[PDB]
Amino acid sequence: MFRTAVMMAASLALTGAVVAHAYYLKHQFYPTVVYLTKSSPSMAVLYIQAFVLVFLLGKVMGKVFFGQLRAAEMEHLLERSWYAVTETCLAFTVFRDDFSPRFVALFTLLLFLKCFHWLAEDRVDFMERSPNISWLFHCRIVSLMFLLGILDFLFVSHAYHSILTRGASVQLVFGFEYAILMTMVLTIFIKYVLHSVDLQSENPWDNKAVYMLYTELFTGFIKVLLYMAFMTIMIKVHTFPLFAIRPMYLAMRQFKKAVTDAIMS
Amino acid sequence: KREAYRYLQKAAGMNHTKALERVSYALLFGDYLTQNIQAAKEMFEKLTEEGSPKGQTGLGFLYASGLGVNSSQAKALVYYTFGALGGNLIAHMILGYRYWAGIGVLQSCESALTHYRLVANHVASDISLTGGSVVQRIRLPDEVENPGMNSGMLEEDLIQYYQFLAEKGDVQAQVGLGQLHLHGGRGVEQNHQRAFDYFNLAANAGNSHAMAFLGKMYSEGSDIVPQSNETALHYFKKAADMGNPVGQSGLGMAYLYGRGVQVNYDLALKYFQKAAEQGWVDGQLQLGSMYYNGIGVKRDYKQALKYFNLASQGGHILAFYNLAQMHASGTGVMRSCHTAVELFKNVCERGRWSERLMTAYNSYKDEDYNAAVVQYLLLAEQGYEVAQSNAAFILDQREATIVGENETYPRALLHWNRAASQGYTVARIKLGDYHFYGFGTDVDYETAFIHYRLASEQQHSAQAMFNLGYMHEKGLGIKQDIHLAKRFYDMAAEASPDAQVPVFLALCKLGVVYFLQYIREAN
Amino acid sequence: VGSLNLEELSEMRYGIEILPLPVMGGQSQSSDVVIVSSKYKQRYECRLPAGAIHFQREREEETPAYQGPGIPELLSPMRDAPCLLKTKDWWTYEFCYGRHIQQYHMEDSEIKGEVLYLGYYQSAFDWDDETAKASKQHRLKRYHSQTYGNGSKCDLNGRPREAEVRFLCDEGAGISGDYIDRVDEPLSCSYVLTIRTPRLCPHPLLRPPPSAAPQAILCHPSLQPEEYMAYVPGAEEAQKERQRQKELESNY
């Protein structure tokens, strides 16, 4: 993590230089802050420092929960992160609410949770074959599962309250994304308990593995249903969705492959 | 100009007063010549011993503002009074401000009223015989604190765009450029030739204001275009044919003073009323003047007062002059001296010498801060608001090397105090800072608190409210109360949208301290 | 570049008067005289007062306690004529001394809308308690303050309206009577009334110290030592006429 430490040190030095420049421009306490908030490049450097701190926190949390593993997990993280960044910015333009740093923070937190969900899926796929099974692995998995579930439930409840009170303007995107994340967490829990039952039973117990596949396909159906409902509401409210069309196609393709595999089997 | 002043210096020293006075007032202010404070003092002393109004006024300024020779508010008063009695105007305005603000001499409204009335009468004659020059007042504190705004002077790109539009054929652009060149200012020097050319170009298209201003210029006369009463009358008639309020006012003036036609009061009254009904300031002023004087009508002071108020809201100096005269003499309205003095002061701050500010401003942008600070000290002796603030600011940042670096803060505090009494929020906040940190005077949290509170109450300054919240939180001057601090921070937040982040951070700090205290007291 | 006597500028005050025609010029040059010539080449000599060169504080006695009526006694006559009225912007305030503070909207000399209570008489600030810092504030700022609480409800926080009624001295209020000068209020229900009255002016501590002593400047027209033996509202206008006439006549 030498490169991460170097990057965070560089960002900290840059923000310290910006703060020092502002302070030496206005010796008081209020005008320096108002100049920082009025000048654009200084606020941009502050945003970069905030993003770097978020990245450091994400690295710490990933080391605590999963721990390194530096593999296709990282490649999937990068690919889905680029896709999610494109989708998020698209959905942001989808509405006139530009800038709005609180909404930017909300989107960043959503991206944080989505990246952690993808890493959880990759760790589940690694666990299904031949992991370093121990007490700590189970503890990490259950702790991450409970944390993600609690946070997702709280945020979806807040989104439901917001859309009931204010309306379906921008909070519905968060609601649907966190609903998809809840489906992902349900799939993760099902896969983990199935693998635990398979491991604790010594014998392969294949009669349940097919059932696990059944559960998987059912969950996929649920997911695609949610997505199509999203599409419906997104054509009911505004003109035409643009941000989620590619994820819709991906979900449709995955469900089609799953149902074809189930039929041929 | 430099070569002209070289000729003057060659003719100065020991021969004839005019060049001596000119070169002395150039040496003192550092403009058009290298500043020589001691040489200026010598010239002023020689002129005072021999006798001259301007030479005595300069020496009085030196003895009053502390430049060059040791300050003495007793001899400076003598020199100022002899300059005022000699027939000068700068001495008159300086003495008027000194009596109005209670500086140096005992406070009184009568003496300041007299001095400002004399200066206002002279400047009113000047603007009536010339037309008046629009003064562009720019203050360094707001420019430095807000560098992204456009100052009173128009940007060069905007001037180029306006000239391009005028050359393409835009009649309104031509009229605007002609008006700017005739009046001057806003980044454009006053030019009669360019204004005349633009008015001629716009008149060929059919613009009422074009021939209206052409007739006004012909009636008033100029060094370039010779005076022609017949041409002015023709242009006024042509403008008034299509319903131009400026042309109507010009034709009414011609009828009143018999320029081109005979003296007819009824037609002048009708044209003035027609011009006033269209919102034209000059027409309203003329109608109010003829109603107050009773020229052709009965002397009803109510309508004259209303028209003068409307013209003053329009921005005409003569309206303020007449209103101050009415308030001083008790004519039409009750005799109140304070309002008359204020109106006379606002009139006098529009004289020819008021242009010197720009020159001083120029010397501020040329890094020659000494001459800028001397010009600003002079124009702050006269009681300007912009000059006092600018001089205090320059003395504050220590860019002026003329004053002793162990005495910049006393004078800066003095000028901030003067600028606070004329209603300037920045001055009150800076006085609070000076008494807070320890600049100028010893450390005194009580006085800083008082000035901050006064600024917050009078002008509703967000930074004043934030500093009040800080003082209540830290327990400086007043008892340490957190609830009042929260109230003041909320008031600062609601008083301005830019105070969101600092108030939020200060409230976060206060909440952290409150939580720590709660944990300490609770088990 | 040079010294600036800020203390002299603040405290010392002068005024110039020219005598008709004495003869100075040959006497001591003790730096208390200045040689200045008029526009018509006539020379004068203005003799400065004692406080011009050397600044000396007048030995003013320290402000003692009022041997006569006290501060509450000076404010006692306010009960005789209470309920001072003053209209500012959209609201008119009625200060009934010792009774209450009221706020209401007046249209065509008629009270309209809800009538608001700003506070009732709670207590008076006693000047005999010098231990409190409020005594220092009052003495350094020269105002006598009272509090009015338990007023009408505030539609922002629910706390009762609180009013701070402070009195200052003003001789110009002797003819016009007691009148409320300033009204201050932040967005909260915290009213501040500043009233200038002449009843408490005779109090030395509350009366601001003028300490002016307008030391006059005497400009005795000077003459050469060779011609000396051969010759052996309306107030301001009169003063200026005197000055100009003296200058013109001495020019002869």
Task: Pick the closest to residue C198 from C179, C176, C166, C170 (CA basis).
Answer: C170
Classified as helix, coil or strand, B496 is coil
Considering only CB atoms, A33 lies closest to which of B433, B467, B501, namely B501
Pairwise CA distance, residues B245 & B275, whole Å: 4
Half-sphere exposure of residue A240, counting CA atoms within 13 Å on the CB side? 1
For residue A2 the two structure tokens come to 């030498």
Distances (CA, A) of C157 to A142, C46, C161, C184: 47, 66, 10, 19
Given a contact cutoff of 8 angstroms between Cβ atoms, the answer to whether C6 and B440 are in contact is no
- Alpha-carbon gap: B327 to the closest alpha carbon of chain A (Å): 43
Half-sphere exposure of residue B55, counting CA atoms within 13 Å on the CB side? 23
Residues 6+ apart with CB under 8 A from B434: B409, B412, B413, B416, B440, B441
Given a contact cutoff of 8 angstroms between Cβ atoms, the answer to whether C75 and C167 are in contact is yes
Number of H helices and E strands in chain C, helices first, is: 6, 12
Given a contact cutoff of 8 angstroms between Cβ atoms, the answer to whether C96 and C85 are in contact is no
- Alpha-carbon gap: B433 to the closest alpha carbon of chain C (Å): 20
Pairwise CA distance, residues C197 & B70, whole Å: 42
Pairwise CA distance, residues B53 & A94, whole Å: 74
Determine which helix (DSSP H) or strand (DSSP E) holds B282, and give its type and residue range.
helix B281-293
Helix H, strand E, coil C: the string for chain A is CHHHHHHHHHHHHHHHHHHHHHHHHCCCCHHHHHHHHHCHHHHHHHHHHHHHHHHHHHHHHHHHHCCCCCCHHHHHHHHHHHHHHHHHHHHHHCCCCCCCHHHHHHHHHHHHHHHHHHHHHHHHHHHHHCCCCCHHHHHHHHHHHHHHHHHHHHHHHHHHHHHHHCCCCCHHHHHHHHHHHHHHHHHHHHHHHHHHHHHHCCCCCHHHHHHHHHHHHHHHHHHHHHHHHHHHHHHHHCCCCCCCHHHHHHHHHHHHHHHHHHHHC
Q: Which residue of C has its CA nearest to B457?
A: C184
Given a contact cutoff of 8 angstroms between Cβ atoms, the answer to whether B215 and B236 are in contact is yes
Q: Is A37 exposed, middle or buried (0-12, 13-18, 19+ CB in 10 A)?
A: middle
A37 neighbourhood in chain B, CB within 8 Å: 498, 500-501
Known binding-site residue numbers of C for a mannooligosaccharide derivative: 90-91, 103, 155, 161, 185, 191
| Interface contact B73-C137, CB threshold 8 A | no
Q: Which residue of B has its CA nearest to A29?
A: B502
| Interface contact B499-A30, CB threshold 8 A | yes
- For residue C191, which phi and psi values (nearest 5 degrees)? -90, 145
A38 neighbourhood in chain B, CB within 8 Å: 498
Pairwise CA distance, residues B46 & B13, whole Å: 10
Given a contact cutoff of 8 angstroms between Cβ atoms, the answer to whether B174 and B163 are in contact is no
Helix axes B90-100, B75-86, angle to 10 degrees: 130
Name the structure determination technique.
cryo-EM
Chain B neighbours among C 49-108 (CB < 8 Å)?
49, 52-53
Given a contact cutoff of 8 angstroms between Cβ atoms, the answer to whether B85 and B55 are in contact is no
Supply the DSSP symbol for B475. T
Q: Which of C11, C31, C37 to mutate to test the interface with B (most CBs of B within 10 A)?
A: C37
The one-letter amino acid at C34: V
Give the other-Cβ count within 10 Å of B343's Cβ. 24
Find the length of chain A.
265
Pairwise CA distance, residues B260 & A215, whole Å: 105
Task: Pick the closest to residue C164 from C142, C182, C141, C140 (CA basis).
Answer: C182
Pairwise CA distance, residues B28 & B36, whole Å: 6
Supply the DSSP symbol for B204. T
The one-letter amino acid at B486: K
Given a contact cutoff of 8 angstroms between Cβ atoms, the answer to whether B183 and B134 are in contact is yes
The one-letter amino acid at C228: Y
Considering only CB atoms, B49 lies closest to which of C1, C37, C140, namely C37
CB pairs A-B closer than 8 Å? 24
- For residue C148, which phi and psi values (nearest 5 degrees)? -130, 120
Pairwise CA distance, residues B205 & A220, whole Å: 77
What is the β-pairing status of strands C190-197 and C162-169? parallel
List, edge to edge, every strand of the sheet that includes C33-37: C14-18, C215-220, C43-47, C33-37
A36 neighbourhood in chain B, CB within 8 Å: 501
Pairwise CA distance, residues B320 & B326, whole Å: 10
Distances (CA, A) of C227 to A165, B197, C38, C46, C47: 102, 65, 18, 19, 21
- Tokens 């294949």 belong to A206
Determine which helix (DSSP H) or strand (DSSP E) holds C227, and give its type and residue range.
none
Residues 6+ apart with CB under 8 A from B315: B281
For residue C116 the two structure tokens come to 């608001």
Given a contact cutoff of 8 angstroms between Cβ atoms, the answer to whether B94 and B81 are in contact is no
Given a contact cutoff of 8 angstroms between Cβ atoms, the answer to whether A30 and B463 are in contact is yes
For residue B307 the two structure tokens come to 């028209």
| Interface contact A30-B502, CB threshold 8 A | yes
| Interface contact B498-A28, CB threshold 8 A | no
Resolution of the experimental model in angstroms, please? 3.6
**Region of residue C147 (phi > 0: left; psi between -120 and 50: alpha; otherwise: beta):** beta
Residues 6+ apart with CB under 8 A from B420: B427, B428, B431, B451
- For residue B479, which phi and psi values (nearest 5 degrees)? -60, 140
Classified as helix, coil or strand, B483 is helix
Considering only CB atoms, A33 lies closest to which of B433, B467, B505, namely B505
For residue B253 the two structure tokens come to 């003036």
Q: Which residue of C has its CA nearest to B484?
A: C188
| Interface contact A37-B498, CB threshold 8 A | yes
Task: Pick the closest to residue C220 from C32, C52, C51, C50 (CA basis).
Answer: C32
Considering only CB atoms, B72 lies closest to which of C52, C235, C240, namely C52
Pairwise CA distance, residues C190 & B115, whole Å: 43
Task: Pick the closest to residue B355 from B140, B165, B184, B169 (CA basis).
Answer: B184
- Alpha-carbon gap: B493 to the closest alpha carbon of chain C (Å): 12
Task: Give A131's strand partners.
Answer: none
- Alpha-carbon gap: C105 to the closest alpha carbon of chain B (Å): 23
Classified as helix, coil or strand, B49 is helix
Given a contact cutoff of 8 angstroms between Cβ atoms, the answer to whether A126 and A191 are in contact is no
For residue B268 the two structure tokens come to 């002048």
For residue A259 the two structure tokens come to 């149902």
Supply the DSSP symbol for C78. G
For residue C236 the two structure tokens come to 């301001």
CB pairs B-C closer than 8 Å? 121
Pairwise CA distance, residues C81 & C64, whole Å: 29
Supply the DSSP symbol for B301. H
Q: Which residue of B has its CA nearest to A30?
A: B502
Pairwise CA distance, residues C191 & C168, whole Å: 17
Task: Give C95's strand partners.
Answer: C84, C101
Half-sphere exposure of residue B180, counting CA atoms within 13 Å on the CB side? 20
B65 neighbourhood in chain C, CB within 8 Å: 4
Asked if chain A contacts chain C via 3 or more Cβ pairs within 8 Å, the reply is no
- For residue C128, which phi and psi values (nearest 5 degrees)? -70, -15
The one-letter amino acid at A171: Q
Q: Which residue of B has its CA nearest to C11?
A: B104
Pairwise CA distance, residues B439 & A109, whole Å: 48
The one-letter amino acid at A251: A
For residue C209 the two structure tokens come to 């110290």
| C-alpha triplet B279, B281, B285: angle, nearest 5° | 120
Chain A neighbours among B 490-509 (CB < 8 Å)?
498-502, 505
Q: What is the DSSP string of C98-143?
A: TTEEEEEEEETTEEEEEEEEEEEEEEE--TT--SSHHHHHHHHHT-
- For residue C97, which phi and psi values (nearest 5 degrees)? -60, 130
| Interface contact B74-C141, CB threshold 8 A | no
The one-letter amino acid at B76: A
B461-499 burial, b at 16+ Cβ within 10 Å, e below that, comes to: bbbbbbbbbbbbbeeebbeeeeebbbbbbbbbbebbebb
- For residue A247, which phi and psi values (nearest 5 degrees)? -60, -35
Give the other-Cβ count within 10 Å of A31's Cβ. 17
Give the other-Cβ count within 10 Å of A138's Cβ. 13
Residues 6+ apart with CB under 8 A from C124: C72, C75, C146
DSSP-H helix ranges across B87-191: 90-100, 109-130, 140-145, 156-168, 171-183
| Interface contact A37-B501, CB threshold 8 A | yes
For residue C101 the two structure tokens come to 């503070």
Supply the DSSP symbol for C171. T
Helix axes B385-397, B369-381, angle to 10 degrees: 140
A151-181 burial, b at 16+ Cβ within 10 Å, e below that, comes to: bbeebbeebeebbeeeebebbbbbbbbbbbb
Give the other-Cβ count within 10 Å of A188's Cβ. 20
Given a contact cutoff of 8 angstroms between Cβ atoms, the answer to whether C148 and C121 are in contact is yes
Known binding-site residue numbers of C: 90-91, 103, 155, 161, 185, 191
Please tell me if residue C37 touches chain B, with a CB cutoff of 8 Å.
Answer: yes
B70 neighbourhood in chain C, CB within 8 Å: 2-3
Pairwise CA distance, residues B205 & B195, whole Å: 16
For residue B325 the two structure tokens come to 């005269």
Chain B neighbours among C 154-213 (CB < 8 Å)?
184, 186-188, 212
Contacts of C among chains (3+ CB pairs under 8 A): B
Find the length of chain B.
523
Classified as helix, coil or strand, C36 is strand
The one-letter amino acid at A12: L
Given a contact cutoff of 8 angstroms between Cβ atoms, the answer to whether B391 and B405 are in contact is no
